[PDB]
Amino acid sequence: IDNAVLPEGSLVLVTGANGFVASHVVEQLLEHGYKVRGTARSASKLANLQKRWDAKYPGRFETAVVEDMLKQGAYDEVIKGAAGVAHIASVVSFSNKYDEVVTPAIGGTLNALRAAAATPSVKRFVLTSSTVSALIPKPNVEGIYLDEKSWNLESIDKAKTLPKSLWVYAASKTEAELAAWKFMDENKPHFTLNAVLPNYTIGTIFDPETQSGSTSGWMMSLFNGEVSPALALFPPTYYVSAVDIGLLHLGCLVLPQIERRRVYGTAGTFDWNTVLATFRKLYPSKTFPADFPDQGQDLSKFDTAPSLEILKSLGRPGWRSIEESIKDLVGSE
């Protein structure tokens, strides 16, 4: 990578490396010559992914165990020697008290930032956030533009008032990311922070046994013919390729021109009927559900300027298409 701020072969700590999105961040780091120390709550969580990375990138991936993200000193061992940190682990609480969800969300974010601030070798920190820190999609509503100053302030109220799950998740992601930027502003540490905000990530599932509770796992369920009533809870939104998400994290870790940015992972709009149409083109002889009721379309637009700058600097023309992203997940013919 031209002008990479982390020298080739540098070590990057990736927390929560067994997650679906996180595993694509790992893969792109390893693909570009970096060493990765990937954490999980137990070594068994990473066993299958470790075997893949041991074959594909021998000697470049190391499993690490961080059982408790919230513990003081949780990262004291695994941060050592790291030049970059991709913080993809999070504590997701299902408590019916708002503070019991938002407190560990913020705490897990700050715990990693504090460890990085205490480690002089860390030059770059990338936080995995979500487009829900900007908005929950509003189908068929015009005039919505999201830029790097857009925040889901609406979600905090709804999470405290509604007698839902999506709004509570949105509020916790919003508060966690705000706490990260506030940490940088209060403490002015020696490293630079960027955040990647994926929308609906579509790509290859490297380990289906453990990664099927993910955006791509739910899509794979539909490919196999299942029609959960829960599909109606997903509004029309933007997709993004899993490879592209990995590249966006890589660019946030190594590209000199990307500093203090919120990088939207928002390639194009889609709904479940777009997915079904793509399935039918990829597998014309496979049986798929007929179209779902119309849910409207996402008419919002995101400022993807830093995202496209990253992709171009990394040798990509632009976003991977939804057809290619879904093919990465399900194959073709």
Curated annotation (Swiss-Prot):
Stored Gene3D superfamilies: NAD(P)-binding Rossmann-like Domain (3.40.50.720)
What's the top EC group for this one? oxidoreductase
Q: So what EC number does this one have? A: 1.1.1.2
According to UniProt, the reaction catalysed is: a primary alcohol + NADP(+) = an aldehyde + NADPH + H(+)
| MF term (GO), any | alcohol dehydrogenase (NADP+) activity
Q: What does this protein do?
A: Catalyzes the asymmetric reduction of o-substituted aliphatic and aromatic aldehydes and ketones to an S-enantiomer. Reduces ethyl 4-chloro-3-oxobutanoate to ethyl (S)-4-chloro-3-hydroxybutanoate.
Instruction: Give the pH dependence of activity as annotated.
Output: Optimum pH is 5.5.
For whether the record's keyword set contains Nucleotidyltransferase, the answer is: no
The UniProt keyword set, sorted, is: NADP, Oxidoreductase
Q: What Pfam families does the database record attribute to this sequence?
A: Epimerase
Thermal behavior of activity: Optimum temperature is 40 degrees Celsius.
Complex and partners: Monomer.
* Family per record: Belongs to the NAD(P)-dependent epimerase/dehydratase family. Dihydroflavonol-4-reductase subfamily.
Classification from the root reads: Eukaryota, Fungi, Dikarya, Basidiomycota, Pucciniomycotina
Q: What is this protein called?
A: Aldehyde reductase 2
Amino acids binding NADP(+): 169
Q: How is its activity regulated?
A: Inhibited by quercetin and diphenylhydantoin.
